[PDB]
Amino acid sequence: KQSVVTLPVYLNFTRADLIFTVDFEIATKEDPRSFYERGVAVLCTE
């Protein structure tokens, strides 16, 4: 019920279908700005 990086989850590689969102913990020296710029996401099928 109750930094941090949020990543979309897509069903296939084309990223045309969004299922749900996942919040991940970022490492010490990494950058959420870079993570958002690089288009990091989660795919269900590949």
Side-chain angles (χ1 to χ4, degrees), residues 14-22 24 26-28 30-38:
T14 181
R15 300 186 179 180
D17 298 303
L18 166 67
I19 313 287
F20 68 113
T21 75
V22 186
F24 260 74
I26 186 154
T28 73
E30 299 275 6
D31 205 53
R33 207 179 324 286
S34 299
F35 269 97
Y36 287 153
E37 276 200 25
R38 280 170 99 95

